[PDB]
Symmetry: D2
Subunit: 414 residues, 4 copies
C-alpha cells in the first residue's frame, strides 16, 4: 500500500498494532475456555484488563527468537507474574492463533467492503432511474445498432454489482472460521470442547478439518469474489471512458475534462485481478502446512482490501458526480435512421403474408418513412394497415417499450 | 482438447453438431412462444420434427456469409417452404440464440462435473474411513511435528471438495440464464412476455439486464469455482506425490512405482487455473457487446469442462487404487520420540503448580519416559500423579483422541 | 486447437505423426554417434531408410505398456531383426528423446512465427508510409489533444513488433538445446562426446546442465516473448476498434461494417497471455524431474503456436485490407481549434519578454474576441504592446507544417536503412 | 511494500523525494538543451544549484491542482523569480517528464538487482564446487533413479540464474529510453535535436516512436524477465525444501531446524510472478495514452524491485549458510543397489552377442541368487557362456567412478572461463 491511496481505517486493520491486538483476543478466547479445565477462573479477564500491545518490543524480541509469534507471546508474558502468565498460549500451535486472528481482520475488512459495495449499488440505481427515459444509441462492436434506454447502462452495472454483493453476503454468513486444534489438527492438549467454547467467544464457526493451519481455499474463495468485482469495476470504468471520449462526449466526470477517475479505477481493477493467482497458489501447502503463503499474504491481503475499499468509494463518487449530457445523447439518436429498415421489415413480415426478401425489397425500395411505406401497400399491393409513426416520440415508445419491466425485475423493491 | 485426454461425452457436448442442435432448440423455444402472437400454431413443432443439423453445410454457407449464425439459420431455413420458415429467427439478435444455447451446453457439462465431483468425495471419505486408525507423523515445513490420524489427510481433502461441491450446486440452482431481448436488450420486436415463455420452455431463468449478450461474469464465476477446484486437486496430488517418494514411501499408486497419475493431475490443475484470467478478462466487453470473448470461449470452455471431468475421474480412480503401506507409516511414528518432550512439559504445567522452565528443565533433564519422570517428582519434588504411559498404544490414544469428533463434524451423515 | 482456427502446417508439426518422426530422428542421431563406439557402422542409416512411423500401432502398444516411449520404441524395433534393433534407445533416458525432439518441433514452429511476424512488420510499415502524410487528432484519455501524423499510429505498432521480432531472432540463435545425458543428467552409459556428436547431427547446442529433462525455463522464456507479442497484438487491435467505431469512423475493415477481425484477435491475445503462467509454473519441477509439465505442454504448446501463427496472419491481412478514410480523419482536425492556444501561448512566451500568466490572458483575449488567429494576435502585440513578431499563419497548411514538422526524423530513426543513401 | 521486508536503499529510490529529484533532473536536461534555442545560457545550471525537493509542499499544492506534475512544477517555480522559472517545463508534456524520470528510477533499481543476482550466481557456484565430489541419489518422480553429483544440483541452478543474468545485462544495454516529444509524440514545440541533446545529458537513448507516453512493453519485458527469475528462485527453494524434510534430511538451513527461509522465498516468487500479468495488461493503452497504468505502477513497481532485491539477498545468504550433510547423502547411495541392474544390462548388451531379453534374465539371475555383483556375473558369463569379460567392480568407489565420470566436463562447459588455462 502507498500513501496516495491509503484508506486509514483499512490500513489500521492490517497494521501491526491491530494484528497483535487480534492475536491477543484469540489467545484470551482459548485461555478463557481453558478456565473450564486447568486455568484459574478470572485469568483471561485479568490479562485482558492490563495487556499492552508493543510492536517495537515485539520486533526487538523477534531479532533474537527469529519467530514472530514467540516474540509476541514473550511481549505479553513479560507484563505479568510468572503465575498469571503460566497458561498463556497453552496447548495451541502458533497458527491456531495466527489464522484465527487473521479471520478477525478479514471479517472486519469485509464489513467495510460490503458497506461500500452497497453504497455503490445505490448510486448506480439512482443514476439508472435518473437517465431511464433518455434514449441513446446502443452499440455493438462499437457500431450503432438500435436505440435503447441510457439508464439501462447503469442498471446493467447495478445488477452485476448486486450479484457480487450477494456473493459477499453469502461468504459473510458462511465463509470464515477459526481453529484451536494444536500442532497438526490432532488435539494433543486441547479438546474439541475447548475449541468450540473459544470459537463461540470469538463469534465464528470451527474449521471442520484444520491442520496446523486453516486451509487457504477459504481466502482464495473470497479473493476470487473480489476478482469478479474487479471485472465489474473495469467494465463500468471502460463504459464511462468510452462515453467520455471527445468523439462521443455523452458524459463527463464532474469537477480539462478527462476520465481520469475511471482510468485510475481501471488500474486498481488490474491490481485486484492479479491477486487471484496468488491466493490460488497459496492453497497448495505441503502436508500439515508450509509457511510460504505467509509472506505473500502479508503483501497482498492488506493491499487487496485497501484497494477494494478505495476503488468502490471512488467509483461511487464518480457515478454520483458524473454529468450526463442529455441533448448530445438524444441528438445522436435523431441523427441516425438506419436501424429503422429492420423495424419496418419486421413490421411487414409480422402484419402481412409476404416473405422477407419481398418485405425487404419494398422497404429497400423506399418525409415520413411510415407514410410512404403505408401508401405503397395500399396503392400497389392493396394491403391496408396502421403503420406507427417513427418520429422521435414514436421511436422512444418503440425502443423503450419494456424498460419498466426491465427495471422491475432488476430491483427487489419494484 | 487432444485425443489423449478426450472424454467422449464431454467433447460431444461442445462439438459443432451439438452446438447447432442447442441453437436450434433455443430458436424453436422463442418460435413456439411467438405462436401466442403472429406465428401460426404448430410451426415450431413442424420444424422440430424435420430439421437436420448439417455442420459441413453450415461451414460452406459461412464461407459466403462470413457470419456463423446467419449460416446456421440459412442451413435450417433451406429445408422448409418459404412459408414454414418465415418466422424462424424472428425478432431475436444472433447472440440471443448463441448465449442461450451456450447456457444449455454449460448446464449439460456441469451435470457431469457435479456427478464426478460427488464420486470423488465419496472415494475420499471411503479412504479416510479406511485409514482413520492408522497413526502417522504429521509434518510442518516437511519436518516431523506430532503424530496424527493418517485418515485425516483424506478427510481434509474430502471436506474441501465438499465445499466446492456446494459452490457448484449453488451455481446449478442459481447461475445460468437465457435471453430473448433483441439487438441491444431493448425489445424492439420481442416482448418480455415472449422472452419469459421461451425461457420457461428451456427451463432456465431470464437475464435481469441483458445487452446484445448475456453478461460474462456468470461464466467467470463458474470458471472461478473450477479454479478453486484445481487448487484442491493440486493440493491432493502434491500430498500423494510427497508420500509416494522413495524417502517416505508411505503410499504407492496402484497398478516401476511412480506417482505418474498425480503428476499428470498437477499439470491438469495448472491448465484449469490458467482459464480464470481469460474468463475475468472476457467480462470487460465494450458497450452493448464486443465479440472478443467468442474466439477465446471457443478454445477454453470445451477444454475447461473436458479437463475437469477427466481430472476428477482420474483422481477418483487413483484414490481408489492407492496402496497405503500401514507398517511403514506406523513404524515411522515408532522411530521418532522427540514430540514427547512437549507432551510431558504440558502435562506437568497442567497437573503441577510449577512453571514452564521448571517443568521444562525437568523433562529436559530426563525405558519408560513416563515412569522415570513420575519417579522423579515423587522422589525429589514430592509430588504424586498418574502419568500416562506413552508406549505406542498410549501414543495412539493421545494423538487420535478427537478423531471421531473430527469425522463426525466433517460428514453430514455422522 | 479447433478446426475453425487450425492452420494446417502448424497442427501437422504437433500431430502424432511428426511427433514420432522427430523422436525417430533424435534416436538415430545418438545411435549414429554411438557407432563410434559399440554400434556397428551403418546401423543408424539402415533404420533411417526403412523405419515407418505408425501412430496407430503406437497407440495399441501404449494400451499395454502405459508408457508412450516404450510403445514408440517397440513400434520401431518390431520392424527390424533383433540384431539390427539391438542398440536402439541405448543409454538414453526417455526424456533425452522426448525433450530433444520437442526442441525440433519448437524450432520448426518458430520458423513460421518469425516469417509471419516479420511479414506483419512489413505490412504495418507499408501502412505507415502510405498514411504518413495524413493529419489526424492525437488523443489522450480519449480526449482531443494535438494533431499528429496518422501514419505514426502504424509506425508505433511497427517498432513494437520489431522489438519482438528481434527478441525471437535472438532466441532462434540461442534458446533451444538438446540433451543426451541419461537418467538424471549423469552420463552412466553415454559420454559427453557422444552427446556432442549427436547434437551436431541435429544442429542444436547441448544443454549446459540437464537433468532427466531439459530445464523448462527455455520454453518459459519463449512463451514470455509470445506473451509480449500478445500485448502488441491487443494494443493494435484496440486502436483499430476505437477508430472503427461509429462515432469516430476513421477506418473500416475491408472486405456490415464492423471490426470483427480485430475483436477476434483480441480474443486470441487473451489466450496467448494465459499460457505465460502455465509455462512459468512448469519450471518448478521436483529434483531431477517430474512429469507434471507434460500433460500441460500437450495442450498449450500446439495451441500457442497455432494461435500465434493464425493471429499474425489474420492481423497482417486485416492491416493490408484496412480502409483509411482520409477526409473524415482530416476534417476532424479542421473541426477542432482548441490546441492552438497552447501553440500561441508558447509562441508568446518564447518570443516576448512577457511572462506566462500575461501571455495567457492575451491569447485568451484574441481567442474569445475573434478570421486569422495569427494575424489578429500579431496585431494586438504591436498595437497593444509595440512588439514586432512574425507569427506563422495557422491555417490548415500551417497546422500541418507545425504538427508534422519532425515526422521525417521519426520514420528515419524507426526504420534501420530508411534515410540511408543506398545507391 | 511492508517494513518487514523493506530494503532501505530500494524503497528510497521509489520514495517521493527521489521520484521528484529524478523529475527535476529530467526537467533540467530538456531545459539545458533548450538553451541552444530560446532559453538564456546558464538557466538550467542556476536552478540545478538551488532548487529544493519538498514532497510535503507538493502534496499541499496537489490538493488544489488535482494534478501531481503541476504541483511539482509549482513547487520548483515558486523558489525562483518569474524570469528564472519562465522556461521551466516548456514544450514538454507531463509524461515526457514522468516517464523519462521513471526510466532513471528503474535504471538505478536494476543496478541493485543485477549486483545481487550475480552475487547469488557466485554463491551457487561456490556451493557447487564445494559439493561437486559428493555422490547423491538422483530422483525422478521423487523416486530413486541413479547416483549423480550433489554439486550438479547447485550447478543447475547456477546456469539458470546465469541465463537470467544475461537477459538482464542485455536489457541494461538496451531496454530503457527517454522521451521529449510533447503532447502526443508530435514535436509541436520541441525538436528531435532538443530531445536528443537532453537524452544525451541523461545518458539514455531516445524512444523510437513515443506517444504522450513511452510504450509500456519495455517495462513489461523487464517484468517478464523478473517473472522467469521468480521461477528460478522457486525451483531452487523447492529443491532445498525437499532435501530439508525429516524423511530426507540431506541439508538444513544454517543459523528448530526448518526450511523457513526457502518457504519465505517461495512466497516471494508467487508475488513476483503475479506482477507479470499487470505489466502485460498495462501495455494496452488507448490511442496516444491513457493513465490507467499509473496507479498500477505506483503499487507494483516498487514492490517488484523491493521483493526482487530482498529475495536475491536472502537466497544468497541461505545458500552460503546451508549445511550439507555429506554422510547422510552418501549413505543413502550406499543403501540402494537397484540402479545397478540397468548398468549390468547395458554392459552385457554392449559386450556380448546376446540380445536384451537374454541379458536381462542373466542379470535378474545373479541379482536374486546373490558379495560382489560384478565378479559373480563375470563368473557366470565365462562359466555359463564361455565369454571373457573385464567387468569393473561396482563397489562404492567404482559406483562413484561410473556415475560421476563426466562431472568435470559438465562443470567446464557450464562456467565460461573454468577449464581454460589462464596463467
Ligand atoms: N510452524 C510455524 N507456525 C507459525 N509460525 C512459524 C512456524 N515456524 C516458523 N514460524 C515463524 O513465522 C515467521 C514467518 O515469517 P515470514 O515468512 O516473513 O512470514 C518466521 O518468523 C518464523 O520463525
Ligand atoms: N453482433 C453479432 N452477434 C453474433 N455474431 C456476430 C455478430 N457480428 C458478427 N458475428 C459473427 O460471429 C462470428 C465470430 O467469429 P469468431 O470471432 O471466430 O468467434 C463471425 O462469423 C462474425 O461474422
Ligand atoms: N521418467 C519418465 N520419462 C518419460 N516418460 C515417462 C517417465 N515415466 C513415465 N513416463 C510415461 O510418460 C507418459 C506421460 O503421460 P502424460 O502425463 O499423459 O503426458 C506416461 O505414459 C508415462 O508412462
Ligand atoms: N495527460 C496527463 N499526463 C500526466 N499526468 C496527468 C495527465 N492527466 C492527468 N494527470 C494527472 O496524473 C495523476 C494520475 O493519478 P493516479 O491515477 O493516482 O496515478 C492525476 O493527479 C492527474 O491529475
Ligand atoms: Cl521521411
Ligand atoms: Cl521504409
Ligand atoms: Cl573439473
Ligand atoms: Cl569455477
Ligand atoms: K463524433
Ligand atoms: K423486483
Ligand atoms: K527416508
Ligand atoms: K455431521
Ligand atoms: K534508419
Ligand atoms: K568453460
Amino acid at each position: 500500500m502507498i500513501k496516495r491511496y491509503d484508506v486509514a481505517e483499512i490500513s489500521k486493520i492490517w497494521a501491526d498494532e491491530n494484528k497483535y491486538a487480534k492475536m491477543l483476543e484469540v489467545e484470551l478466547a482459548i485461555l478463557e475456555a481453558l478456565e473450564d479445565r486447568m486455568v484459574p477462573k478470572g485469568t483471561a479477564a485479568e490479562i485482558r484488563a492490563r495487556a499492552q500491545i508493543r510492536p517495537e518490543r515485539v520486533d526487538e524480541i523477534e531479532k533474537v527468537t527469529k519467530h514472530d509469534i514467540i516474540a509476541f507471546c514473550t511481549s505479553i508474558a513479560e507484563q505479568f507474574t510468572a503465575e498469571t502468565g503460566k497458561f498463556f498460549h497453552f496447548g495451541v500451535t502458533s497458527s491456531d492463533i495466527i489464522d484465527s486472528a487473521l479471520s478477525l481482520q478479514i471479517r472486519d475488512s469485509m464489513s467495510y467492503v460490503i458497506k461500500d459495495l452497497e453504497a455503490l449499488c445505490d448510486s448506480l440505481l439512482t443514476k439508472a432511474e435518473e437517465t431511464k427515459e433518455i434514449i441513446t444509441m446502443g452499440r455493438s462492436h462499437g457500431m450503432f445498432a438500435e436505440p435503447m434506454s441510457f439508464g439501462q447502462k447503469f442498471l446493467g452495472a447495478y445488477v452485476e454489482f448486486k450479484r457480487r454483493l450477494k456473493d459477499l453476503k453469502d461468504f459473510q454468513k458462511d465463509g470464515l472460521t477459526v481453529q484451536f486444534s494444536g500442532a497438526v489438527g490432532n488435539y494433543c492438549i486441547l479438546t474439541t470442547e475447548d475449541e468450540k467454547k473459544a470459537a463461540d467467544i470469538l463469534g465464528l464457526p470451527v474449521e471442520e478439518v484444520s491442520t496446523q493451519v486453516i486451509p487457504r481455499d477459504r481466502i482464495a474463495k473470497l479473493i476470487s469474489i473480489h476478482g469478479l468485482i474487479a471485472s465489474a469495476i473495469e467494465r463500468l470504468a471502460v463504459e464511462i471512458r468510452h462515453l467520455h471520449r471527445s468523439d462521443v462526449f455523452e458524459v463527463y466526470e464532474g469537477f480539462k475534462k478527462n476520465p481520469i477517475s475511471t482510468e485510475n479505477l481501471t488500474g486498481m481493477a488490474r491490481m485486484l485481478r492479479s491477486h487471484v493467482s496468488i491466493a490460488l497458489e497459496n492453497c497448495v501447502l505441503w502436508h500439515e502446512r508450509d509457511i510460504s503463503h505467509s509472506s505473500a499474504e502479508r503483501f497482498y491481503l492488506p493491499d487487496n482490501f485497501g484497494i477494494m475499499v478505495y476503488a468502490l468509494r471512488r467509483m461511487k463518487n464518480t457515478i454520483d458526480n458524473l454529468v450526463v449530457q442529455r441533448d448530445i445523447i438524444e441528438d445522436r439518436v435523431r441523427s441516425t435512421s438506419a436501424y429503422l429498415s429492420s423495424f419496418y421489415l419486421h413490421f411487414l413480415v409480422a402484419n402481412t403474408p409476404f416473405m422477407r426478401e419481398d418485405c425487404y425489397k419494398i422497404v429497400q425500395q423506399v418525409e415520413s418513412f411510415s407514410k410512404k411505406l403505408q401508401k405503397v401497400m395500399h396503392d400497389e399491393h392493396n394491403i391496408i394497415l396502421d403503420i406507427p409513426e417513427m418520429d422521435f416520440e414514436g421511436i422512444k415508445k418503440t425502443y423503450l417499450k419494456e424498460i419498466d419491466h426491465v427495471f422491475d425485475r432488476s430491483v427487489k423493491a419494484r
